[PDB]
Amino acid sequence: SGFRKMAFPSGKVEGCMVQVTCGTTTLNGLWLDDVVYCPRHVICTSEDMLNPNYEDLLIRKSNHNFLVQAGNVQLRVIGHSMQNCVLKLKVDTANPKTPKYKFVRIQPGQTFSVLACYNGSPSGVYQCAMRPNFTIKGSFLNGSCGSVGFNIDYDCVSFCYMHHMELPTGVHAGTDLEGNFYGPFVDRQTAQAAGTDTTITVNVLAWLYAAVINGDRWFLNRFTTTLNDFNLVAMKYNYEPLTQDHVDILGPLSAQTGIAVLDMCASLKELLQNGMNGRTILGSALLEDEFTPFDVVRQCSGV
Amino acid sequence: SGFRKMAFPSGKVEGCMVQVTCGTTTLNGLWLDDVVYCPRHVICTSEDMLNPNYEDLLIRKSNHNFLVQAGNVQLRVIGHSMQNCVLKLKVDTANPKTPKYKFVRIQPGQTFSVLACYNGSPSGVYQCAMRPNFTIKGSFLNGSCGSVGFNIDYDCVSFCYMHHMELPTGVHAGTDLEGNFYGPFVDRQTAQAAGTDTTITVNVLAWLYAAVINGDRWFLNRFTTTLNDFNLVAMKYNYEPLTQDHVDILGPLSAQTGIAVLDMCASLKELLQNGMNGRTILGSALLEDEFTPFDVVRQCSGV
Numbered sequence: 001s002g003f004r005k006m007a008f009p010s011g012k013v014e015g016c017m018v019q020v021t022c023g024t025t026t027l028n029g030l031w032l033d034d035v036v037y038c039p040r041h042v043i044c045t046s047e048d049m050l051n052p053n054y055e056d057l058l059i060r061k062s063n064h065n066f067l068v069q070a071g072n073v074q075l076r077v078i079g080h081s082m083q084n085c086v087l088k089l090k091v092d093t094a095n096p097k098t099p100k101y102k103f104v105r106i107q108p109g110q111t112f113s114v115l116a117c118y119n120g121s122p123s124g125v126y127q128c129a130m131r132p133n134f135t136i137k138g139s140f141l142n143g144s145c146g147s148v149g150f151n152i153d154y155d156c157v158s159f160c161y162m163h164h165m166e167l168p169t170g171v172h173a174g175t176d177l178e179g180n181f182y183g184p185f186v187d188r189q190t191a192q193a194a195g196t197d198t199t200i201t202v203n204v205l206a207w208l209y210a211a212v213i214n215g216d217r218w219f220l221n222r223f224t225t226t227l228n229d230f231n232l233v234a235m236k237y238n239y240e241p242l243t244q245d246h247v248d249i250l251g252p253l254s255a256q257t258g259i260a261v262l263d264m265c266a267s268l269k270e271l272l273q274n275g276m277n278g279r280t281i282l283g284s285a286l287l288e289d290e291f292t293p294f295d296v297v298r299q300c301s302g303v
Numbered sequence: 304s305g306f307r308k309m310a311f312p313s314g315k316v317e318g319c320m321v322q323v324t325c326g327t328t329t330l331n332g333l334w335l336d337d338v339v340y341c342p343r344h345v346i347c348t349s350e351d352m353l354n355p356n357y358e359d360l361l362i363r364k365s366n367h368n369f370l371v372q373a374g375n376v377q378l379r380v381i382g383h384s385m386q387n388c389v390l391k392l393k394v395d396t397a398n399p400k401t402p403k404y405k406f407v408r409i410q411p412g413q414t415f416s417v418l419a420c421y422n423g424s425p426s427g428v429y430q431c432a433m434r435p436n437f438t439i440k441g442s443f444l445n446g447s448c449g450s451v452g453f454n455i456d457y458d459c460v461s462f463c464y465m466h467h468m469e470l471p472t473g474v475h476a477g478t479d480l481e482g483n484f485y486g487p488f489v490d491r492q493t494a495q496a497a498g499t500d501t502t503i504t505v506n507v508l509a510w511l512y513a514a515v516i517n518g519d520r521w522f523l524n525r526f527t528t529t530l531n532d533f534n535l536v537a538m539k540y541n542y543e544p545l546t547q548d549h550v551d552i553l554g555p556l557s558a559q560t561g562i563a564v565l566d567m568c569a570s571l572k573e574l575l576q577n578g579m580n581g582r583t584i585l586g587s588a589l590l591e592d593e594f595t596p597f598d599v600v601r602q603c604s605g606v
């Protein structure tokens with residue numbers, strides 16, 4: 001038993017990380033088959049970054065302006081192209097470590113593993129949820145751009161995130177691997193703010209089920225509630241409304257524990273209205289919303 | 304910026320995980336050069352596990368009783384031996400993916416990455432601290448034994464933990480890679496309890512410095528305290544005493560922030576005596592003690 005925030009094993013992605021240098025700018029790229037993907041702002045200079053015109057900037061580049069390094073081996077760039085906010089550099093070598101992969105775009109409320117990288121070299125792995133306001137709460141320093149986020153399903157890597165920037169609140173923004181930003185953000189050095197966020201209700205309930213599966217039961221009660229009466233409370237506390245599809249997604253956890261979803265919603269209502277009174281749930285004094293129902297089932301089915 | 308609990312990239316260890324089966328028992332092993340390491344209780348049966356005599360049990364085994372699988376390739380066992388609570392199986396093939404490695408034993412208060420595995424296949428990665436009572440707070444189901452814990456330093460993997468069992472409180476116990484248990488535990492199915500735990504004071508202060516580096520400053524104050532007067536408060540709240548070596552270890556973080564250690568100790572004293580009054584620190588409503596000073600420096604020096 002036990003419940004821990006857990007990343008996917010990162011080996012398959014570590015074999016894809018390279019270093020991309022253009023001018024005095026160095027960041028990370030993703031080498032799949034004979035293409036390297038990286039943030040297009042690698043071609044910017046300090047002054048270009050206030051309001052660059054990337055079509056102009058790229059036209060003024062040629063293949064020899066891009067230095068790609070896969071460990072010690074330098075890869076020869078034989079083509080370059082822009083796809084939205086990502087640059088695609090064709091190289092003279094197919095990555096022999098290319099896994100089965102897909103490019104997928106994730107929804108707010110879903111999770112993925114981030115492999116933080118610097119100078120083409122992986123440094124650490126951790127889990128993130130895409131917030132309702134299309135930001136993630138990550139850990140990224142200068143040089144981390146081009147680090148990617150991903151999920152793994154039966155040795156197929158679904159890439160969903162490439163890192164591009166940090167907002168003033170300390171949260172992080174980036175694109176899918178088609179180079180389309182998550183959220184209303186742009187890759188230039190101007191004042192940008194995340195919209196207001198909300199709490200992911202279905203994830204909180206999933207984590208409450210994880211708590212019960214692991215022996216935390218103090219917050220349970222005999223009451224049930226209706227979907228409508230719960231959603232009235234949710235709106236008050238800046239929680240997303242619960243839909244019948246969310247109840248259905250929680251079905252398997254409801255079955256394993258014998259606690260109906262609307263039974264657990266009564267617990268959440270009382271937790272929202274009364275707090276915890278000094279107690280904790282799975283070691284947290286706060287209600288956690290960064291675990292999906294799938295994340296919970298992944299750790300808890302064997303208990 | 305940003306501060307996240309972060310595992311080491313797990314690729315180098317994923318290339319070492321195999322599956323070890325004996326009788327109806329299957330768990331994980333660690334394949335380095337031509338030796339596979341696994342928990343010795345793989346040789347037990349359901350009834351052996353109450354109070355096994357492992358020397359007897361091993362003498363009654365031979366090489367052909369052990370089935371080792373590295374993916375689809377079956378490895379031939381050519382020798383077996385016991386080293387304390389781990390079994391060493393010599394196989395006919397050196398692992399071509401063997402990294403530079405060491406076997407190290409860690410101290411309470413230190414952290415490491417756990418690569419959770421099932422049937423020889425990695426499933427997820429996360430960070431653990433060795434508690435003062437020699438347990439870890441992990442996530443392990445049936446079949447996870449032989450999963451290992453490790454740190455990485457300049458492409459050298461220091462292995463420090465192999466998983467063996469779960470205690471009744473839901474916490475986890477195991478050995479170093481020499482097969483010597485952390486703590487006063489034994490590998491048999493009897494009633495065993497962890498001693499009382501304490502909070503790792505130097506880690507809490509390290510996390511407070513991480514908070515300041517990331518812009519959380521509300522808990523700071525103008526006061527300083529003495530080491531003796533702090534340790535009087537620490538004893539009251541079940542915190543470990545702070546030593547001059549702990550102040551020294553925190554030196555670099557103290558320098559980066561311009562906040563002396565005994566200056567931060569005054570903050571911690573007030574937090575212990577007054578709580579947070581509804582506020583959070585790096586997104587936590589509780590004081591966190593699972594980050595070492597090294598873990599913090601690793602993420603925060605570039606800020």
Ligand SMILES: *[C@H](O)[C@H](C[C@@H]1CCNC1=O)NC(=O)[C@H](CC(C)C)NC(=O)OCc1ccccc1
Pocket residue numbers: 027041044049140141142143144145146164165166167172186187188189304
């Ligand atoms: C790319 O490596 C870098 C990642 C930033 C650097 C600090 N934390 C991150 O996530 N991205 C940028 O530097 C980005 C480039 C623009 C052309 C989009 N700008 C940016 O993030 O500015 C915000 C910032 C905040 C704090 C420190 C440095 C930059």
Ligand SMILES: *[C@H](O)[C@H](C[C@@H]1CCNC1=O)NC(=O)[C@H](CC(C)C)NC(=O)OCc1ccccc1
Pocket residue numbers: 001330344347352443444445446447448449467468469470475489490491492
């Ligand atoms: C080895 O795979 C297994 C790991 C346990 C299983 C559940 N969570 C874990 O960490 N170890 C054992 O099963 C261990 C074997 C003895 C011979 C040492 N016994 C054990 O952990 O018993 C406690 C237990 C608690 C909850 C479920 C199952 C077993």
